[PDB]
């Protein structure tokens, strides 16, 4: 049959979000609050096109908007967020229910400053 | 590093089985208005060592077996299944953190009747074979209420994960919402491991035809199963407080509760006469099994009528 | 007690699932770039290995349709070392 | 992999202790003798009742095998159907025990 | 197809030819029949898990339960034969030649 | 060697079947079927069917083969067996050697010689197991299947008590 | 109807307890007010990704942000 | 047996056949066959003698082997098609295995070696159930997979069943073994026309069920299980000899009787399809069936074998057996040939 | 008297204390001073392998936070 | 006979387990959902005799999605040629197929 079409290695380069899983799970709810629109354009494009090759560019917008999410944490509230994701990172199941007061301090700092 | 973890599991299992014999003889001593062994060690602490060194240099019985291979494989399967029941136990962290550790323990305890069956068939005495068939029928009888009580309890847990069963009991012991299942569970674990008032292998037992070494191996597999089922009942009904930053609070707490429950086994074997065989078959098939089915229906329909269905994860 | 605490556990489970739902577009995009990276690397190594073979078409799909087919485990890890193969194909099953 | 290492370690310790227990007093020399049981040489009479309790176990164990996905099945969205079929399986297990009762099947192993 | 399917099908054929060629006992025939069932269980399970076909995960359990019930029925027949002749030998079952 | 592990387990599976299809005695045959059930459970467990492999233990081995060994112990108490065993083992090793020297074979169907790790999926199923959810759907979706299985088990109890009565 | 009940509670208390617990387990989910909340919780537990919709222009009941007012609400689950 | 338990068990047999008929899923086909076997086992062990236990053991072994081959065919269909619909099979290995499994369930030759044994071991009402109701499920499964059946395999099974069921009944004096070899030959006739026109397969199945039920109902009413016991019927009740005469002349395909109705229509659907040799061999082989039917009519109806003295006592008592539908079955199994184009109701 | 049994019970209790305490110490040793990551579900394993790939030392327990991104 | 009671009474006894493309719990897709959807929507209503020869492309793509015969044959081909070139010494594996390149995400 036909030759399969794959994008080049230069097309797939983007600045990666090089953080751990607990760093993501700690800031997950503020990410879902603040990075709604490019993520939903991407997942709508991903369920409609049914092809990752048609969803590269929108995917980069995801990886463009997550980093702008984290820089704005790194500028303002890097210490309460680090103190929070470390406590999330200790647990094996990574519970939220073990870490409510660092969550309260981080959400206080986010609500005030951002 | 992990082999160190397996050995630090299974060597203190064997030492706890060793000193369980001393604890049993001392507690049955004082409950019978006498003393247990206190001559050999200081307060008797060298009695299991003396017992083991005596048994391992006793002459073999040198019997004629119908099969060499099953006569060898019955203590092998006995020790293997008796030691691998310990590995999913969350105390506070299990050796093998598996998703279906409850079902693992139920299946491996169901496989332990092949040791009774093979070690009774391997003896040439047909009366020993009758004793083995009666003991296997006893054990597979009480496995039914093991399975159904275990299912009815884990309807309030959410999954077959043993470690989630601590997170379940952060607010109450699970003996409070399910005490009839708890008391039938305790008697059913008492009748699995051939423990009094259900030890009809004392009366010809199935393993009266083995040497003193292999009889010590069957005996220590039996006691590993006793300590294990008491730890499993402790985790499953009497679950302790768990601090993720100080795990030894959970370890000391479930240890004290499991010791009190094993001492309760010892305190039950020194209190009651033995059931007759049809009387414990009457206890299972006509008393424990109707209540177990009724409470199974109640614990199916109970989280639905209360809107208290536990999470899967 | 189990009524209150299982209702609380359902609320906590819904919270963790919403964390996963907030994270899924990023992880999906990274997974897409991951598998397209691996297929492009496998395509270039197929183009530099399958040169002597007569009548060979590099990157010829085995399907008649032009639709995207989800790549198999041997399509991504077919040309890598045994450690990456074992870690990717039995990692979650053999994890404890 | 850690599980297979654990199983192999437990089987190795079991095999090593069985090898010790069968072969450490073979170093002893002690003696030999003749060494020729309530029943002497009569063959085992077949008791039908032990077979009946074995098959009754097997049938109720298959019914338990059906009942095992109930903690997972409680999470469903078709809860009226799920509750009906759960109570129906436990009711048919009860009907199996009632028929096992009233036909004197649980007798002399009651 | 896959390589494991060759071994599971060859296991089914081995247990078939064991079940199709009796030696002496009826119990050995029932054991070969349950080995056939075991190989069918493993083969159905590998297909249903391999394809991620979700609803057929309740299929092998059914394939277990019925067939295991079948085995119970077979054991009962064996016992009845062993209550007539004293052994479970398949050469005792030859009255229906006449 | 390790990437072929499921294949390796399947080899032991077939070896175990020649253990009891040769029919040495019903008790060694039951032992061979127990070992076969253990390694076939290992085959199932290495795909992610944890519940189904534990049903092989709990219900097949620990539930039914107990009753086989139990009935056999109370209802029973060569060179053909050995020749059958070596013939089955040699046919299995010829199959192994063919499909390992060719990476492709065709006995009745065409079989690849690579490891069966290649045919897996490169995705995750989230916060469940797909196999556990497909078994949980026995009560919500599988109503008729539960009805006919419960009726067959009730009738199984009835039929066993009728035919073991002798009257 | 009651002398029989005292009779069977004297002779076989285990079976009276068994049929009473099974009878409650059958009839009592139909009588409880909280059986509705079991379904309302078990459908509100999001195992899947809530795949968004293409905004044509007439969906006033579908939000465009998770913190919009319109859409399904789980304040009943917090309050109960 | 308790009459309630007998009713529940016969409803379980019927429910198993209905689940084989009405279901669109292969696992439910297999469940229906398992349920049918599991419930028919007490009907065979109704009288509790060693011959019924041997017949039940042989029936269990053959039907269990057949059900395992059936599940292997279903599983290979799941391999090569990924689906469970009860329709054509997507692999000739699955087609061969399912045709073999259904042949073992029908007792078609060379898998016929259980049918004259098991029918001899069990009572006449249980033999009636085995030879009539137990053919309805596998002929339905063969009816639904006929785009997949290899023509050579099913025709080999058909003609081999006809010849072996022809030569089998010539040596038999037991009535149940005669009816069993008659069963094998008529199953060969039903499967021979299956891939050409399966409406004639259903027609032969219905006419066969009517004639076999007539003969077993006459045997039950007269309590005759051997040839020589059937020979005493003229002195006990003479109308039964006329009925076994007309029914055995029906079953041999003799016109104007309705047992000529299937095979003629079968020939009528095979000479359409350029097959002249095969229905000619089938027709010539059916004369063996007609020969041992004529043997039974010579022993029962057309002569008077000598009876015993004690038959004089049995003159003084009427038959009180519930001969259910015996006049209806005897009319329908003889006088139905003028209504031959009724077969279109089976289309 | 009855307190004579407490040495044997104490030795048995120490032997029951050893496996869980030791496996807690070994889990905290092998995982960067933290608990072992519990991966019962496929998503937890995907996040764990993503940690292993972003750590840069092929150990999932090296947590990279905001100091890693710009 | 196929007495279609389920279509007559309108009940759904067992159509739900019948195909992979049917409704699954928690919307879990099968690995060949698109291929079987194309094969069934090709072959619906046109009868089996037309469906065996007019839907051959869809069914062959779906069958090769099922068993992966052509894909594993192609992987045998590429791996065999690669191993021959490594044995001859004419090819080297790259750094990313030796496991030394700090993977993507
Ligand atoms: C459609 C297919 C229908 C198939 C037949 C269904 C019924 C028969 C099967 C069940 C059975 O055994 O029933 C007993 C059966 C008689 O069986 P038996 O014991 O062998 O009969 C011998 C003597 O009749 C015993 O006599 P008795 O003295 O003991 O009792 C007198 C009895 C008293 O009757 C009553 O009491 C009946 C009143 C109650 C009826 C139900 C009420 C609820 O009257 C009769 O029995 C008269 C004969 C009835 C006809 C029998 C044959 C029926 C037709 C069979 C199919 C014909 C198809 C021809 C096709 C031709 C072309 C191919 O039937 C009846 O008793 C009543 C038959 C009613 C027929 C209704 C037809 C229309 C349906 C719409
Ligand atoms: C797990 C943690 C620890 C658990 C407890 C451990 C300490 C207790 C140990 C005590 C010593 C046990 C030694 C062995 C005992 C063996 C004897 C034995 O168990 O016999 C069982 C006996 C058997 O009965 P029996 O033989 O004594 O009586 C005669 C019975 N017939 C007539 C049949 C011959 O009792 C039971 O089976 C009862 C089981 C538990 C019942 C639970 C009932 C719960 C309440 C239900 C509802 C009631 C109210 C009414 C309805 C209300 C509705 C709103
Ligand atoms: C850890 C749990 C406990 C493990 C087992 C106990 C630990 C110590 C094991 C070795 C104990 C000593 C050897 C076994 C007992 C010997 C008793 C005996 O009668 O020996 C005489 C026997 C033979 O004595 P004999 O030649 O007079 O034979 C007596 C029999 N007649 C007279 C009929 C010929 O000695 C031996 O067989 C020697 C065995 C090994 C000795 C120790 C070697 C080093 C071990 C370290
Ligand atoms: C005796 C049997 C009693 C229980 C019967 C089923 C009760 C029930 O709620 O069924 C709804 C269930 C399910 O209905 P449902 O409303 O959940 O269907 C919606 C579709 N799904 C499940 C995909 C979301 O079953 C049926 O509707 C049909 C199956 C049962 C049909 C009756 C069988 C009778 C057998 C007699 C012999
Ligand atoms: C995790 C915890 C597990 C704990 C397990 C162990 C529990 C028991 C702990 C020990 C209890 C006390 C033991 C005391 C032994 C007897 C000491 C003694 O005095 O023995 C005297 C004996 C003969 O001496 P003699 O020279 O004849 O004296 C004449 C004097 N004019 O001299 C002798 O017999 C020689 C000396 C023998 C000493 C034996 C000591 C016991 C060994 C037990 C093995 C296990 C030890 C602990 C292992 C775990 C910790 C590393
Ligand atoms: C007479 C012979 C000798 C007798 C003595 C020795 C044999 C008997 C005693 C040993 C019994 C062995 C039991 C092995 C399987 C136990 C079940 C099991 O593995 O369950 C654990 C787990 C499922 O849990 P889950 O968390 O869902 O999976 C991990 C994904 N998160 O699953 C996993 O973690 C899967 C891990 C990978 C797969 C492991 C497969 C191992 C090989 C199979 C068994 C080998 C032994 C065969 C013979 C047994 C005899 C009965
Ligand atoms: C509708 C919901 C679902 C109901 C079914 C679910 C049941 C769950 C529990 C499983 C029970 C399975 C086994 C039951 C067997 C019953 C038959 C029986 O045991 O009868 C015999 C018994 C007398 O025993 P006997 O034969 O003498 O034995 C010798 C030593 N006892 O006879 C007796 O003891 C008399 C038994 C009958 C009278 C019991 C009355 C109980 C009343 C409870 C409160 C009201 C419940 C209302 C529900 C409907 C009741 C019909
Ligand atoms: C040609 C068809 C068979 C193909 C496989 C042949 C394997 C080798 C066996 C050859 C025949 C050996 C033999 O004597 O078989 C007869 C034996 C039953 O006879 P028995 O009563 O034990 O001994 C008296 C003589 N018949 O029968 C048996 O013991 C049969 C046991 C068969 C188990 C099959 C094992 C695997 C064989 C290879 C794969 C198929
Ligand atoms: C497209 C096809 C779809 C399906 C269409 C319908 C197919 C119908 C197939 C009929 C098969 C009949 C099977 C046998 C009868 C079933 C009921 C039964 O079990 O009757 C036996 C019963 C047992 O009585 P018992 O007392 O045990 O006998 C020993 C002596 N005391 O009682 C007796 O022994 C009493 C003696 C007389 C019994 C006569 C029963 C005749 C039933 C068949 C009638 C003819 C067939 C229907 C019309 C044609 C349909 C194709």
Domain boundaries, chain B: 1-313
Residue of C nearest to G75 (CA): C11
Instruction: Write the residue with the smallest CA distance to atom 20 of ligand 9.
Output: H125
Distance CA I49, CA I63 (A): 12
Ligand 4 lined by J11 (C-beta under 6 Å): yes
Instruction: Write the residue with the smallest CA distance to atom 4 of ligand 9.
Output: H136
- In this structure, are residues H39 and F151 in contact, taking their beta carbons and an 8 Å threshold? no
Query: Could you tell me which of J26, E52, F127 has the C-alpha nearest to residue D76?
Result: J26
For B31-90, give the DSSP string: TTTS--S-TTTGGGTTHHHHHHHHHTTSPP--PPBS-HHHHHHHHHHHHHHHHHTSTT--
CA distance D19 to chain F (A): 21
Q: What subunits touch chain I, counting only 3 or more CB pairs under 8 A?
A: A, B, C, F, J
Q: Report DSSP state, residue H344.
A: G
Distance CA E58, CA F135 (A): 5
Coil vs helix vs strand at J99: coil
Residues of C in contact with D2 (CB under 8 A): 94, 96
Distance CA J27, CA F133 (A): 11
J105 touches chain I (CB under 8 A): yes
Q: Do C2 and B172 touch (CB under 8 A)?
A: yes
Cβ neighbour number for residue J86 with a 10 Å cutoff: 13
For E49-70, give the DSSP string: HHTT-SGGGGHHHHHHHHHHHH
Mutate to test the pocket of ligand 2, among G15, G16, G17, G26 (most ligand atoms within 8 A of CB): G17
Q: What subunits touch chain F, counting only 3 or more CB pairs under 8 A?
A: B, C, D, E, G, H, I, J
A100 touches chain B (CB under 8 A): no
Distance CA H293, CA G9 (A): 68
Coil vs helix vs strand at D103: coil
Q: How was this structure obtained?
A: cryo-EM
J52: left (phi over 0), alpha (psi -120 to 50) or beta: alpha
CB under 6 Å to ligand 5: residues? B 15, 41-42, 45, 49; I 11, 14-15
- In this structure, are residues F92 and F18 in contact, taking their beta carbons and an 8 Å threshold? yes
Q: Do B311 and C9 touch (CB under 8 A)?
A: yes
Which ranges of chain H would DSSP assign to H, the alpha helix? 3-22, 26-44, 50-81, 92-106, 115-121, 124-132, 136-144, 151-168, 175-192, 198-222, 227-230, 233-236, 239-251, 260-270, 277-300, 311-314, 326-332
Residue H324 CA: which ligand 1 atom is closest?
Answer: 20
B203 touches chain A (CB under 8 A): no
Residues of J in contact with I50 (CB under 8 A): 105
Coil vs helix vs strand at H318: coil
- Token pair in block for residue C64: 């008649």
**In chain B, which among 118-137 make CB contacts under 8 A with chain F?**
118, 120-121, 129, 132-133, 136-137
> Which among F27, F54, F73 is the nearest to B100, CB-wise?
F54
Q: Give me the residues paired with residue B123 across strands.
A: B65
J34 touches chain A (CB under 8 A): yes
- In this structure, are residues F84 and F18 in contact, taking their beta carbons and an 8 Å threshold? yes
- In this structure, are residues H285 and H163 in contact, taking their beta carbons and an 8 Å threshold? yes
Distance CA H83, CA H78 (A): 6
Q: Report DSSP state, residue A3.
A: B
Distance CA C40, CA A7 (A): 7
Distance CA F155, CA E69 (A): 10
Q: Do H27 and J17 touch (CB under 8 A)?
A: yes
List, in order, residues 6 or more apart from F4 with CB less than 8 Å away: F115
Distance CA J104, CA I58 (A): 13
Residues of B in contact with A91 (CB under 8 A): 244
Residues of A in contact with J104 (CB under 8 A): 12, 16
Coil vs helix vs strand at F110: strand
Mutate to test the pocket of ligand 3, among B48, B57, B213 (most ligand atoms within 8 A of CB): B57
Is B132 exposed, middle or buried (CB count within 10 Å of its CB: 0-12, 13-18, 19+)?
A: buried
Distance CA H190, CA H186 (A): 6
List, in order, residues 6 or more apart from D88 with CB less than 8 Å away: F146, F147, F150
Cα H109 to Cα E16, H168, H196: the distances in Å are 20, 11, 21
A109: CA distance to ligand 5 center in Å? Answer: 63
- Token pair in block for residue H236: 């006990």
- In this structure, are residues H206 and H340 in contact, taking their beta carbons and an 8 Å threshold? no
Residue E97, phi then psi, degrees to nearest 5: -70, -20
Ligand 9 lined by H133 (C-beta under 6 Å): yes
- In this structure, are residues C36 and I59 in contact, taking their beta carbons and an 8 Å threshold? no
Which ranges of chain J would DSSP assign to H, the alpha helix? 5-8, 33-43, 47-54, 56-67, 69-88
Does B197 sit behind a cis peptide bond, omega within 30 degrees of 0 on the bond before it? yes
Structural domains in chain F, sorted by start = 2-164 (1.20.120.1200)
Distance CA H269, CA H278 (A): 12
D and E interact (at least 3 Cβ pairs within 8 A): yes
Cβ neighbour number for residue D43 with a 10 Å cutoff: 9
Distance CA G2, CA D32 (A): 75
Query: Could you tell me which of B113, B159, B116 has the C-alpha nearest to residue D58?
Result: B113
H191: CA distance to ligand 9 center in Å? Answer: 23
List, in order, residues 6 or more apart from H334 with CB less than 8 Å away: H246, H247, H250, H257, H258
G26: CA distance to ligand 7 center in Å? Answer: 15
List, in order, residues 6 or more apart from F91 with CB less than 8 Å away: none
Ligand 3 lined by B49 (C-beta under 6 Å): no
Give the distance, in angstroms, between the CA of residue H60 and the centroid of all CA atoms in the same chain: 18
Pairing of strands F110-112, F104-106: antiparallel
D30: CA distance to ligand 3 center in Å? Answer: 10
Taking each continuous run of H as one helix and of E as one strand, the counts in chain I are 2, 0
- Token pair in block for residue D87: 């109570």
From first CA to last CA, the distance across chain H in angstroms is 41
Q: Report DSSP state, residue F106.
A: E
> Which among J61, J79, J96 is the nearest to C41, CB-wise?
J96
Query: 């197809």: which residue's tokens?
Result: E1
Residue of G nearest to D98 (CA): G15
Distance CA E35, CA E14 (A): 9
Is B101 exposed, middle or buried (CB count within 10 Å of its CB: 0-12, 13-18, 19+)?
A: buried
CA distance F106 to chain B (A): 38
- In this structure, are residues H82 and J31 in contact, taking their beta carbons and an 8 Å threshold? no
Q: From the candidates D1, D62, D91, which should be mutated to test the interface with F, based on the most F CB atoms within 10 A?
A: D62
List, in order, residues 6 or more apart from J8 with CB less than 8 Å away: none
Give the distance, in angstroms, between the CA of residue B127 and the centroid of all CA atoms in the same chain: 26
Structural domains in chain E, sorted by start = 1-86 (1.10.287.3510)
Domain boundaries, chain D: 1-110
Residues of J in contact with F141 (CB under 8 A): 16-17, 25
Ligand nearest to C-alpha B94: 6
Ligand 3 lined by B14 (C-beta under 6 Å): no
| D–G CB contacts, 8 A cutoff, strictly below | 14
- In this structure, are residues B93 and I35 in contact, taking their beta carbons and an 8 Å threshold? yes
- In this structure, are residues D77 and F140 in contact, taking their beta carbons and an 8 Å threshold? yes
Coil vs helix vs strand at G2: coil
G and E interact (at least 3 Cβ pairs within 8 A): no
Distance CA B107, CA B117 (A): 17
Query: 């020729």: which residue's tokens?
Result: D36
CA distance G35 to chain A (A): 27
SS3 content of chain C, % helix, strand, coil (to 5): 65, 0, 30
Cβ neighbour number for residue J45 with a 10 Å cutoff: 7
Q: How many domains does chain H have?
A: 1
Distance CA E39, CA E50 (A): 16
Does B92 sit behind a cis peptide bond, omega within 30 degrees of 0 on the bond before it? yes
Taking each continuous run of H as one helix and of E as one strand, the counts in chain B are 12, 0
Ligand 3 lined by B1 (C-beta under 6 Å): no
SS3 content of chain E, % helix, strand, coil (to 5): 75, 0, 25
Distance CA B131, CA B138 (A): 11
Angle, alpha carbons J82-J84-J86 (nearest 5°): 70
Resolution (A): 3.2
Residue H46 CA: which ligand 9 atom is closest?
Answer: 27
Coil vs helix vs strand at C60: strand
Q: Which residues of G touch B (CB under 8 A)?
A: 14-15, 17-22, 24-26, 28-29, 31-32, 34-38, 41-42, 45
């Amino acid at each position: 049959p036909g030759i399969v079409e794959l994008p080049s290695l230069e097309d797939l380069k983007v600045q990666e979000v090089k953080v751990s899983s607990s760093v993501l799970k700690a800031a997950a709810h503020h990410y879902g609050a603040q990075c709604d629109k490019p993520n939903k354009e991407f997942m709508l494009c991903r369920w409609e096109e049914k092809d990752p090759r048609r969803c590269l560019e929108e995917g980069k917008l995801v990886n463009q908007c997550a980093l702008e999410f984290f820089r704005q944490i790194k500028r303002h509230c890097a210490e309460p967020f680090t103190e929070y994701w470390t406590c999330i990172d200790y647990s094996g199941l990574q519970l939220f229910r073990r870490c409510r007061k660092e969550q309260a301090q981080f959400d206080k700092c986010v609500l005030d400053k951002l | 590093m992990f082999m160190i973890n397996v050995l630090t599991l299974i060597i203190p299992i064997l030492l706890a089985v060793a000193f369980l014999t001393l604890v049993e003889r001392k507690v049955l001593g004082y409950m019978q208005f006498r003393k247990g062994p206190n001559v050999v060690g200081p307060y008797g602490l060298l009695q299991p060592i003396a017992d083991a060194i005596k048994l391992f240099i006793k002459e073999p019985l040198r019997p004629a077996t119908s099969s060499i291979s099953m006569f060898i494989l019955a203590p092998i399967l006995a020790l293997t299944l008796a030691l691998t029941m310990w590995i999913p136990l969350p105390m506070p962290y299990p050796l093998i953190n598996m998703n279906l550790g409850v079902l693992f323990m139920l299946a491996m305890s169901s496989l332990a009747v092949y040791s009774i069956l093979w070690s009774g068939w391997a003896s040439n005495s047909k009366y020993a074979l009758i004793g083995a068939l009666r003991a296997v029928a006893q054990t597979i009888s009480y496995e039914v209420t093991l399975a159904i009580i275990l299912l009815s309890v884990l309807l309030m847990n959410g999954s077959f994960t043993l470690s989630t069963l601590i997170i379940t009991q952060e607010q109450v012991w699970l003996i409070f919402p399910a005490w009839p299942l708890a008391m039938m569970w305790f008697i059913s674990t008492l009748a699995e491991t051939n423990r009094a008032p259900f030890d009809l292998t004392e009366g010809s037992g199935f393993n009266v035809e083995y040497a003193a070494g292999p009889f010590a191996l069957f005996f220590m597999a039996e006691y590993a199963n006793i300590i294990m089922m008491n730890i499993f009942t402790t985790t499953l009904f009497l679950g302790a407080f768990h601090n993720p930053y100080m795990p030894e609070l959970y370890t000391i707490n479930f240890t004290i509760k499991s010791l009190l429950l094993s001492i309760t086994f010892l305190w039950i074997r020194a209190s009651y006469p033995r059931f007759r065989y049809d009387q414990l078959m009457h206890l299972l098939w006509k008393n424990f099994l109707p209540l177990t089915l009724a409470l199974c229906m109640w614990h199916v329909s109970l989280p639905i009528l209360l809107s208290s269905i536990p999470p899967q994860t | 007690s189990m009524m209150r605490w299982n209702r609380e556990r359902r609320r906590l489970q819904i919270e963790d699932f919403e964390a996963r739902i907030a994270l899924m577009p990023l992880l999906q995009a990274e997974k897409d770039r991951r598998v397209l990276q691996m297929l492009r690397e496998n395509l270039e190594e197929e183009a530099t290995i399958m040169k002597d073979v007569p009548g060979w078409k590099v990157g010829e799909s085995v399907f008649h349709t032009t639709r995207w087919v989800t790549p198999m485990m041997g399509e991504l890890y077919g040309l890598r070392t045994g450690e990456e193969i074992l870690s990717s194909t039995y990692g979650f099953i053999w994890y404890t | 992999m850690n599980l297979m290492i654990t199983l192999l370690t437990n089987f190795t310790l079991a095999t090593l202790l069985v090898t010790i227990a069968f072969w450490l007093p073979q170093l002893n020399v002690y003696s030999e003798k003749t060494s020729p049981d309530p029943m002497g040489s009569a063959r085992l009479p077949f008791s039908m009742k032990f077979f009946l309790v074995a098959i009754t176990f097997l049938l109720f164990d298959l019914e338990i095998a059906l009942l095992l996905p109930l903690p997972w099945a409680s999470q469903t969205t078709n809860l009226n159907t799920m509750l009906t079929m759960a109570l129906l399986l436990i009711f048919l297990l009860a009907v199996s025990l009632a028929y096992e009762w009233t036909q004197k099947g649980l007798e002399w192993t009651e | 197809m896959s390589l494991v399917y060759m071994n599971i099908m060859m296991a089914f054929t081995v247990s078939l030819t064991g079940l199709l060629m009796y030696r002496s006992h009826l119990m050995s025939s029932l054991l070969c029949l349950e080995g056939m069932m075991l190989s069918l269980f493993i083969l159905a399970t590998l297909m249903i898990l391999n394809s991620h076909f979700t609803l057929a995960s309740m299929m092998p359990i059914i394939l277990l339960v019925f067939a295991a019930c079948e085995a119970a029925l077979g054991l009962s027949l064996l016992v009845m034969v062993s209550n007539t002749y004293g052994t479970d030998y398949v050469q005792n079952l030859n009255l229906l030649q006449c | 060697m390790m990437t072929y592990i499921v294949f390796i387990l399947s080899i032991i599976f077939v070896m175990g079947f020649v253990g009891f299809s040769s029919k040495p005695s019903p008790i060694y045959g039951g032992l061979g079927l127990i070992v076969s059930g253990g390694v076939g459970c290992g085959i199932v467990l290495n795909f992610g069917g944890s519940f189904l492999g534990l049903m092989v233990f709990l219900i097949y081995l620990g539930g039914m083969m107990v009753v086989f060994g139990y009935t056999t112990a109370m209802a029973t108490e060569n060179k053909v067996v050995l020749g059958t065993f070596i013939t089955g083992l040699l046919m299995e090793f010829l199959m192994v050697y063919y499909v390992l020297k060719d990476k492709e074979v065709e006995i009745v169907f065409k079989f690849n010689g690579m490891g069966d790790w290649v045919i897996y999926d490169t995705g995750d199923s989230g916060f469940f197991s797909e196999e556990a959810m497909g078994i949980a759907a026995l009560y919500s979706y599988g109503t008729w299947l539960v009805i006919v299985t419960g009726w067959s088990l009730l009738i199984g109890v009835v039929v066993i008590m009728e035919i073991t009565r002798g009257n | 109807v009651a002398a029989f009940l005292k009779n069977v509670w004297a002779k076989e208390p285990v079976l009276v307890a068994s049929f009473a617990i099974a009878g409650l387990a059958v009839i009592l989910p139909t009588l409880s007010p909280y059986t509705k909340y079991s379904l309302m919780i078990n459908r509100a537990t999001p195992y899947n990704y809530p795949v968004p919709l293409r905004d044509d222009g007439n969906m006033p009941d579908v939000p465009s942000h998770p913190q919009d007012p319109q859409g399904p609400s789980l304040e009943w689950l917090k309050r109960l | 047996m308790n009459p309630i338990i007998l009713i529940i068990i016969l409803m379980t047999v019927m429910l198993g056949t209905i689940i084989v008929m009405i279901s669109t899923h292969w696992l439910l086909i297999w469940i229906g066959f398992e349920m049918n076997m599991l419930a028919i086992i007490p009907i065979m062990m109704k009288k509790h003698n060693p011959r019924a236990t041997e017949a039940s053991t042989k029936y269990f072994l053959t039907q269990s082997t057949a059900s395992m081959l059936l599940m292997m065919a279903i599983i290979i269909n799941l391999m090569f098609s990924g689906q469970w619909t009860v329709m054509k099979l997507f692999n000739p290995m699955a087609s061969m295995l399912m045709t073999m499994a259904l042949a073992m369930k029908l007792g078609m030759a060379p898998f016929h070696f259980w049918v004259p044994e098991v029918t001899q071991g069990i009572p006449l009402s249980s033999g009636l159930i085995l030879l009539t109701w137990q053919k309805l499920a596998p002929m339905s499964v063969l009816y639904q997979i006929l785009p997949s059946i290899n023509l050579d395999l099913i025709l080999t099974l058909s003609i081999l069943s006809i010849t072996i069921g022809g030569w089998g009944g010539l040596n038999q004096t037991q009535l149940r073994k005669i009816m069993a070899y008659s069963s094998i030959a008529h199953m060969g006739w039903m499967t021979a026309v299956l891939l050409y026109n399966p409406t004639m397969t259903l027609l032969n199945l219905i006419i066969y069920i009517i004639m076999t039920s007539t003969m077993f109902t006459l045997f039950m009413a007269n309590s005759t299980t051997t040839t020589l016991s059937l020979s005493h019927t003229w002195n006990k009740a003479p109308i039964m000899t006329i009925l076994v005469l007309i029914t055995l002349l029906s079953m041999g395909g003799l016109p104007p009787l309705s047992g000529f109705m299937p095979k003629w229509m079968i020939i009528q659907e095979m000479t359409k399809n350029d097959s002249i040799i095969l229905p000619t061999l089938m027709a010539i082989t059916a004369l063996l069936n007609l020969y041992f039917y004529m043997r039974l009519t010579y022993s029962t109806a057309l002569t008077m074998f000598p009876s015993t003295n004690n038959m004089k006592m049995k003159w003084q008592f009427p038959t009180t057996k519930r001969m259910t539908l015996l006049p209806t079955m005897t009319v329908l199994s003889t006088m139905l040939l003028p209504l031959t184009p009724i077969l279109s109701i089976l289309e | 008297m009855w307190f004579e049994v407490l040495p044997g019970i104490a030795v048995m209790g120490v032997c029951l204390f050893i496996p869980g305490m030791a496996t807690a110490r070994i889990h905290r040793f092998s995982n960067g001073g933290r608990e072992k990551r519990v991966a019962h579900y496929s998503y937890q394993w995907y996040l764990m392998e993503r940690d292993r790939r972003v750590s840069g030392v092929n150990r999932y327990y090296v947590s990279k936070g905001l100091e890693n991104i710009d | 006979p196929f007495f279609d009671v389920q279509k007559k009474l309108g009940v759904d006894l067992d159509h739900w387990m019948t195909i992979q493309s049917a409704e699954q719990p928690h919307r879990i897709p099968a690995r060949c959902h698109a291929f079987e959807k194309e094969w069934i929507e090709c072959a619906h209503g046109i009868g089996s005799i037309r469906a065996e020869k007019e839907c051959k492309i869809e069914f062959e793509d779906f069958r090769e999605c099922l068993l992966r015969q052509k894909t594993m044959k192609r992987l045998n081909a590429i791996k065999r040629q690669r191993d021959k070139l490594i044995k001859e010494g004419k090819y080297t594996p790259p750094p990313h197929h030796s496991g030394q390149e700090d993977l993507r995400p």
